[PDB]
Amino acid sequence: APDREKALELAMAQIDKNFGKGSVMRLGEEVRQPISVIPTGSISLDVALGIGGLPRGRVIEIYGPESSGKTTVALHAVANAQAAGGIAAFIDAEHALDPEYAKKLGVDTDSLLVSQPDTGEQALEIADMLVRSGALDIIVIDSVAALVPRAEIEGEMGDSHVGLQARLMSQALRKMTGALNNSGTTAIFINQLREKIGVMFGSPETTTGGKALKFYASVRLDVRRIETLKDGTDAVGNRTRVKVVKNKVSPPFKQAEFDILYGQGISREGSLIDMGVEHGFIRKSGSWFTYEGEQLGQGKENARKFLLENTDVANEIEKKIKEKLGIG
């Protein structure tokens, strides 16, 4: 028993020692939690990541079908990074950002460094110089799929092979991790699953030229919409499910759910209630949500709305949910 786990612990040790820390883990471990991280905006996801936020100095990949909430997740990541006084950059190749929305999420759009690259290489090239200045904290590349090769934009092949794409990522992605691991800048790449009932186009590790992103990525998130919320009226948002299919900073395969309110973002309040009851602090006596004595109204909405106009207590619920589990 000890002799067995003794040689095993030795084994693991050396492996960690030669291939990096989280190279081998017991899905049950509780990792040696870091001091700096980037909250995602949902306590659920935050904890599901094991370190209370996204890791710094690592490349994070977020993929899922269109309209699944990838960017909303990434936007908060940006907003938070900012609140803590950090600088952000957004390399855009989709031309689909809506600032008013970001603003409503907490993004300081005015100080938001933005770029709309000409060619795919130019893109990653700019992201690199940017990260090397070591002044940025977070940088998100909107759409892995959009970063098309110069060659493709002017004369050569059609989807790769006769010219350049699945390598552009590789090349770039390799010289960039080192810069990141030093600068302490977390990078977010947004990938796509290209369809929703298809037949013949662009993939790799599931997706787009990012067969290299699959490995470099220290964390890979699988964002997908599960249900269409309705407040006794119409579409108010969607319940979003997220699976951490790859986590090198902590045991993987953890899942998280949280609703995104159309035009509002990742409902913190809601995330607090669900975790609030999923851990005891709150008690639902049939539509009646209560908290250690005092009530929080009837129905999840009123509870939410409550926690909204009651930050003081809400932070308490949050605090007590964090203290109970892992910090950051």
Curated annotation (Swiss-Prot):
The family classification in the record reads:
Belongs to the RecA family.
Q: What does this protein do?
A: Required for homologous recombination (HR) and the bypass of mutagenic DNA lesions (double strand breaks, DSB) by the SOS response. Can catalyze the hydrolysis of ATP in the presence of single-stranded DNA, the ATP-dependent uptake of single-stranded DNA by duplex DNA, and the ATP-dependent hybridization of homologous single-stranded DNAs. Numerous X-ray crystals have been resolved under different conditions which indicate the flexibility of the protein, essential to its function.
Residues reported to bind phosphate? S67, S68, G69, K70, T71, Q192
Q: Which PROSITE patterns match?
A: RECA_1, RECA_2, RECA_3
Which InterPro entries does the entry link to?
AAA+_ATPase (IPR003593), DNA_recomb/repair_RecA (IPR013765), DNA_recomb/repair_RecA_CS (IPR020584), P-loop_NTPase (IPR027417), RecA-like_C (IPR049261), RecA-like_N (IPR049428), RecA_ATP-bd (IPR020588), RecA_C_sf (IPR023400)
Cite the HAMAP family for this sequence: RecA
The protein's organism comes out as Mycolicibacterium smegmatis (strain ATCC 700084 / mc(2)155)
Which of UniProt's keywords are assigned here?
A: ATP-binding, Cytoplasm, DNA damage, DNA recombination, DNA repair, DNA-binding, Nucleotide-binding, SOS response
Q: How does it assemble?
A: Polymerizes non-specifically on ssDNA to form filaments. Interacts with and activates LexA leading to autocatalytic cleavage of LexA, which derepresses the SOS regulon and activates DNA repair.
The disruption phenotype is: Not essential in the absence of DNA damage, its deletion renders cells much more sensitive to DNA damaging agents such as UV light, ionizing radiation, alkylating agents and DNA gyrase inhibitors and desiccation-induced DSBs. 5-fold decrease in survival, loss of HR, no change in NHEJ (non-homologous end-joining) or single-strand annealing DSB repair.
The subcellular localization recorded is:
Cytoplasm
Which positions in this protein are listed as binding ATP? S67, S68, G69, K70, T71, T72, D98, P99, E100, Y101
Please tell me where this protein is predominantly located: cytoplasm
Q: State the name under which the record lists this protein.
A: Protein RecA
Its Gene Ontology molecular function terms? ATP binding; ATP hydrolysis activity; ATP-dependent DNA damage sensor activity; damaged DNA binding; single-stranded DNA binding
One family from Pfam that matches here is RecA
Give the UniProt record's GO annotations in the biological process aspect.
DNA recombination; DNA repair; SOS response
What GO cellular component entries does it have? cytosol
Q: Look up keyword DNA-binding and say if it applies.
A: yes
